């Protein structure tokens, strides 16, 4: 039982720490988009209608 | 959906071309990768569904069921590889092939745009399921359980075939997007009463509705663990998913045709919940618990309100993980004592401390402790049936009491008290077993942090 | 009666391998089986999958609807219009029977 | 021997009560409502080898 | 299965314990304990057993009327407040066979001595079975009683689960 | 004041008049009961104490009990005036009862809504 | 940060401290300690983060949906027109849910803000909540889980027919 | 490698499936830039609005 | 194994050709008959949903 919990803890943190650190760096050194009116005659890409950088990347890459 | 159909198909050459000793490792790893990619189906819009092509579409209803389906396959391989260890290699691969082919049919079933295509795949799932129960079930009664399972389904599904073909002749299409726009009201007549019954009974038998449920306790007591997991988690939901779709074209006749089936469900859930208090076989008890939980889903679908449809969807997902957990927990005891009798091995918390925690967590979700998605789904149904008729709260409330009693009774009887003196082979929980339990409960409890993704189209 | 093999005795995996994870009799296969399950199950699907869900771009347009509602409530109250009307559709576009 | 678990259950008991007392909506209140009930079950049946405690 | 004497002596013990529950105070209980003992003493030498049975039956009816509804119970007696309290801490000795080698390594002396007991159990078992065979009538045993060992070096038949049972306060 | 037994409160053994009137025929029966119990005890203890055993001591009494409580019922079931009347009384009756309770409640509610006498002022969730 | 007209707030009126005691106010000193120990370090970290954000300014937009013909202008069974009319109706339905939520939020904030005087001082918010709920109920209530623009239009016409009938007999 | 060549079957099945899903879209472009909601004018370098 | 594939494909190709031709003939026959009998296939007068009356069935 002790071994399983250590293994479960290790594999959750294996990617859990890189993701937690990666989000903190993204939030600090990139930041969220700021709301702006669509400039006249400009057509935004579908991924430009979202605020968070990770959300924009998800929509751009996969959706 | 081809990005999921083809890699699912590729699991079969992978299993057959693997090294003899790597069939479980390879099939488990790659079906987890498929499960990972299934999260791309979360691209859902507020107005329109995700319409891939002429054959397949996904919306907020089928998407959570698709993700549950693809998640269950690696869990089923984990659960099966131990009791199949003695089986010869070719028959091990045939077992895995039946599981893979079941997933292929299921993902096509939940995304089929045309209702007759949905029918064929809805029926195709019987074949591998029947083979799994009758070929790899343990006891003599698996043959009878196979027959009851097969003929209960076909007795209802054949009339559905006639009704579906009849609808296409009259309307010109069975495409579900087309029916959304060309649906016409169903007028009162004896012809329409039987069209309604033909459109619904097949899904009722699968749910199962109280009175047509006797095949399900049989199937579970005889199925291998993987059979029980897929039966409880997904195959029951084929009925709910089917009902949620076909009720579109049955209005307003459902207003009065639903009454007998609401009475059977409302009273049925209290009967089946009460029955659980006296069950002597652990698998049979969990099976009767499913009938009670799914009676709520039938009521929710039949009263057709936004709150009831959201609750029905959440309940289907929540019950899928919980009932699959409970069967896996019961099976892990079976692999030690080789009996399903609940009263045989007692006081297991003294011998298996961590497994008793999984037992506690599974029981708490089964009785719908807030804020689990089990409770969210049940609560949304209770809220909507109260408006339908205030008196239903008495029946809903009584079932909540009985549900807690039998869930904790199962926990108390098997885990607490004194251990049985002569049972001296209770070996420590394996890493595989602990991982299997946590791969059920952890996604279940994580869904509480973002419930909207399991609430369905009405969200 | 007939010629049938006796029932074999159930084997405890821990006897031969006290470190067994319960996946396989072969210790090397047993450890690999544990690793794929734990890595692809927990590290990938559950961690990255949970992260992916957390950042879904406005799932089903709930956030856009709130922004749109704010825009309409602002414009309607500025111009002295009803915040919401009982009629979803313009009556001038409807021809009642009789 | 399980004093550590005992103090964890006492702390969880207290947390679910504070959720109950500070809740501003009925669903949040219900979380604390049922939480204290379940923590009562686990602490009343602390000595689980005893049938009377389980009852 | 109870003789007349056993029934009388059980009622005497039971009646005194309910009397003590009513009286509470030791000096008061001593006074009425002697009065009750006198009542049993007057009919001590009854010979007509029909009369003795009638006296016992009437006494039991008297006890039922006058019993305490909430008598004192020793804490660890059945129905007491500590009954079965420590059963959750009692672990059977066979569980040590499943310990990981590193767990066993923490108690090298305990497990060396444990192997001696297992050896003693193994080498004694065949003789224990044989002794029970040759001492049991044809139609199987008629009572639950078990015999002692007869020779030197023998152990009493079926001793393991009595000798190695969990301690009453195992933690 | 005599003891009155009930289903949920048995007669105390010390007040049982058959407890004292014990014949040689009744002592013979008690001896035979103790012989069956002792024979089963020995059979159990020989396996329970066997050092080489690892597993479960299958108990036929437990197997018979679980078998009787399920598989053995329908074969020994006879449709007759008792099971049919109990089958109807507690099988169809509750469904008909609840149908009328809910149907009557919903007809009353629907008639008030159509006439505009049911207060639904803030009812926009359903 | 948000539009004050959409989420209005009365001008806040705080009384000035007016001690009638020689004892010091412990809250005054804890406030100073909190400002020094908690707020200032927190503010410094935020200002560092805001400086990084100012180096990477980028924008996102609120999607604009052009109006298309509604279900009233669609020929029967013309799925192409029905589809565009139906999707628009679904978007408006989601917007109307959030408009009710904004009004409910105003009502709930007034109730807390006005304290024991809320029954009198929140009349305007209560009246607005009552009207929008009535309007919302007329549009969308009773449509069922399989709702649509078609069913919404049918409900409206039933209401229009009832209103005309009553007006005639008057 | 002869040891680990089976591990490409499912990943290649996903790539092939992904590719065929995109091919499916090329047959459903009858309304690309023609819906009343989204129809607009093409940007100077744009050939199609989506693919 | 190669001839099994080739034989199936060869026969399959011609069976598919007949399949498609038979469906082309069905459409050709149907459209000609509709042209020959305009009186049986009148061009439908289509009303909008604003003009069409549908009953409302509340779900309450
Ligand atoms: C498990 C699920 C896993 C899902 C994936 C994770 C996704 C995720 O984390 O997103 C959510 C969120 C991040 O969301 P986001 O969209 O990335 O934020 C965008 C902002 O622009 C970003 O905001 P920012 O620009 O201000 O970020 C700056 C921040 C950096 O912030 C981060 O990036 C932290 C990320 C957390 C790691 C992920 C976990 O760096 C700091 O300065 C830290 C502030 C403290 C300094 C002193 O992470 C958190 O939730 C953090 C934890 C919650 C904050 C603490 C709240 C305190 C508790 C108060 C409520 C409870 C009261 C007590 C009752 C308790 C019950 C009894
Ligand atoms: C407190 C912790 C902080 C927190 O809330 O986390 C942030 C979020 C919730 O907070 P949030 O909704 O505000 O999102 C945070 C990010 N921003 C600020 C950008 C919105 O956590 C999650 O959303 C986690 C959701 C997990 C759901 C997925 C579980 C894994 C699914 C695996 C699939 C296999 C299982 C079967 C699934 C069945 C079908 C669905
Ligand atoms: C076993 C032996 C018994 C075999 C079944 C007996 C036949 C039962 C038939 C029920 C009546 C259905 C019917 O005949 O309706 C015919 C009628 C067709 O007329 P049409 O011109 O197309 O439309 C106008 C309606 N007059 O209208 C219709 O076509 C509507 C009917 C739609 C299709 C009905 C499908 C079969 C219904 C019967 C099964 C329903 C109950 C299912 C129970 C299963 C339980 C597991
Ligand atoms: C914790 C790890 C999680 C892994 C999954 C997420 C991986 C991707 C993380 C986000 C990557 C960066 O995200 C991306 O950054 C740039 C900002 O520089 C944004 O790009 C935007 O701003 C930049 C200026 O910086 C300009 O190019 C432009 O104005 C605009 O495109 C993208 O809209 C955003 O989506
Ligand atoms: C839960 C996690 C799921 C894990 C899934 C793992 C499989 C991932 C499959 C990746 C498929 C990427 O597929 C490819 O990605 C690139 C990103 O450069 C996209 O790139 C394009 O995105 C959009 C499309 O309008 C536009 O900005 C532009 O055309 C281009 O940037 C392509 O549209 C897509 O063809
Ligand atoms: C033109 C139409 C015909 C198209 C044919 C295309 C594929 C032709 C494949 C020829 C090679 C097949 O290879 C033959 O089958 C399997 C898989 O390799 C091998 O044997 C197999 O045994 C077990 C699985 O049962 C595994 O250890 C491993 O998959 C492999 O060793 C045989 O030792 C080999 O002789
Ligand atoms: C209402 C919609 C669904 C209706 C479905 C009804 C169709 C019939 C389903 C079961 C078919 C099984 O077919 C046959 O049934 C009988 C009992 O019924 C089984 O027989 C079993 O029950 C009978 C009767 O108690 C016993 O005598 C027999 O020993 C036992 O094995 C047969 O072994 C099975 O071959
Ligand atoms: C994107 C796709 C991701 C798919 C992930 C699939 C994970 C599959 C895990 C495979 C586990 C490793 O499989 C195993 O590894 C070792 C080292 O490479 C191989 O080679 C081994 O052969 C012998 C052992 O008999 C030794 O020399 C040594 O132990 C090792 O070199 C084995 O022949 C192979 O069976």
UniProtKB/Swiss-Prot annotation, chain B:
**Key word Mitochondrion present in the record?**
yes
Q: Which protein, by its recorded name, is this? A: NADH-ubiquinone oxidoreductase chain 4
Ranges annotated as spanning the membrane: 22-42, 60-80, 94-112, 116-138, 147-167, 196-216, 224-244, 256-276, 284-303, 308-330, 351-371, 393-413, 435-455
Molecular function terms from GO: NADH dehydrogenase (ubiquinone) activity; ubiquinone binding
**Catalytic activity of the protein:** a ubiquinone + NADH + 5 H(+)(in) = a ubiquinol + NAD(+) + 4 H(+)(out)
The way this protein sits in the membrane is described as: Multi-pass membrane protein
Its cellular-component GO annotations read: mitochondrial inner membrane; respiratory chain complex I
Which EC numbers does the record give?
7.1.1.2
Concerning Pfam families, the annotation shows: Oxidored_q5_N, Proton_antipo_M
Spell out which residues are annotated as carrying N-formylmethionine. Answer: 1
Q: Name one GO biological process term.
A: mitochondrial respiratory chain complex I assembly
Subcellular location as annotated: Mitochondrion inner membrane
Subunit field text? Core subunit of respiratory chain NADH dehydrogenase (Complex I) which is composed of 45 different subunits.
Q: What does this protein do?
A: Core subunit of the mitochondrial membrane respiratory chain NADH dehydrogenase (Complex I) which catalyzes electron transfer from NADH through the respiratory chain, using ubiquinone as an electron acceptor. Essential for the catalytic activity and assembly of complex I.
- Which UniProt keyword terms apply here? Electron transport, Formylation, Membrane, Mitochondrion, Mitochondrion inner membrane, NAD, Respiratory chain, Translocase, Transmembrane, Transmembrane helix, Transport, Ubiquinone
Swiss-Prot record, chain C:
State the UniProt keywords alphabetically.
Electron transport, Membrane, Mitochondrion, Mitochondrion inner membrane, Respiratory chain, Transit peptide, Transmembrane, Transmembrane helix, Transport
The major lineage groups are: Eukaryota, Metazoa, Chordata, Craniata, Vertebrata
Family named by the database record: Belongs to the complex I NDUFB11 subunit family.
Task of the protein: Accessory subunit of the mitochondrial membrane respiratory chain NADH dehydrogenase (Complex I), that is believed not to be involved in catalysis. Complex I functions in the transfer of electrons from NADH to the respiratory chain. The immediate electron acceptor for the enzyme is believed to be ubiquinone.
The protein's name in its UniProt record: NADH dehydrogenase [ubiquinone] 1 beta subcomplex subunit 11, mitochondrial
Q: How does it sit in the membrane?
A: Single-pass membrane protein
Q: From which source organism is this entry? A: Bos taurus
GO CC terms: mitochondrial inner membrane; mitochondrion; respiratory chain complex I
Gene symbol? NDUFB11
Parent sequence residues shown: 54 to 151 of 154
Where would you find the membrane-spanning parts of this chain? 36-56
Q: Where is this region: Disordered?
A: 1-24
Primary localisation category: mitochondrion
From Swiss-Prot, chain E:
Keyword match Cell inner membrane: no
Disordered: region residues: 131-152
Q: Which PANTHER family match?
A: NADH DEHYDROGENASE [UBIQUINONE] 1 BETA SUBCOMPLEX SUBUNIT 9, NADH-UBIQUINONE OXIDOREDUCTASE B22 SUBUNIT
Q: Does the keyword Zinc apply?
A: no
Just give the chief location class: mitochondrion
Please state which protein family the record places this protein in.
Answer: Belongs to the complex I LYR family.
Residue list for modification Phosphoserine: 77
Question: What is the annotated quaternary arrangement, including any partners?
Answer: Mammalian complex I is composed of 45 different subunits.
User: What membrane topology was assigned to this protein in its record?
Assistant: Peripheral membrane protein
Main function = Accessory subunit of the mitochondrial membrane respiratory chain NADH dehydrogenase (Complex I), that is believed to be not involved in catalysis. Complex I functions in the transfer of electrons from NADH to the respiratory chain. The immediate electron acceptor for the enzyme is believed to be ubiquinone.
Q: Where in the cell is it found?
A: Mitochondrion inner membrane
Q: Which organism is it from?
A: Bos taurus
Q: What is this protein called?
A: NADH dehydrogenase [ubiquinone] 1 beta subcomplex subunit 9
Domain of life according to the entry:
Eukaryota
- Give a GO cellular-component term: respiratory chain complex I
Any single biological process term in GO: mitochondrial electron transport, NADH to ubiquinone
Swiss-Prot record, chain H:
Q: In which domain of life is the source organism classified?
A: Eukaryota
The entry's cellular-component GO terms read:
mitochondrial inner membrane; mitochondrion; respiratory chain complex I
Where, by residue number, does the polypeptide cross the bilayer?
Answer: 4-20
Q: Which UniProt keywords apply?
A: Electron transport, Membrane, Mitochondrion, Mitochondrion inner membrane, Respiratory chain, Transmembrane, Transmembrane helix, Transport
Q: Does the keyword Protease apply?
A: no
> What function does the entry list?
Accessory subunit of the mitochondrial membrane respiratory chain NADH dehydrogenase (Complex I) that is believed not to be involved in catalysis. Complex I functions in the transfer of electrons from NADH to the respiratory chain. The immediate electron acceptor for the enzyme is believed to be ubiquinone.
The subunit structure is:
Complex I is composed of 45 different subunits.
Which family does the record claim for this protein? Belongs to the complex I NDUFB1 subunit family.
Q: What is this protein called?
A: NADH dehydrogenase [ubiquinone] 1 beta subcomplex subunit 1
- Species: Bos taurus (Bovine)
Q: What is the lineage of its organism?
A: Eukaryota, Metazoa, Chordata, Craniata, Vertebrata
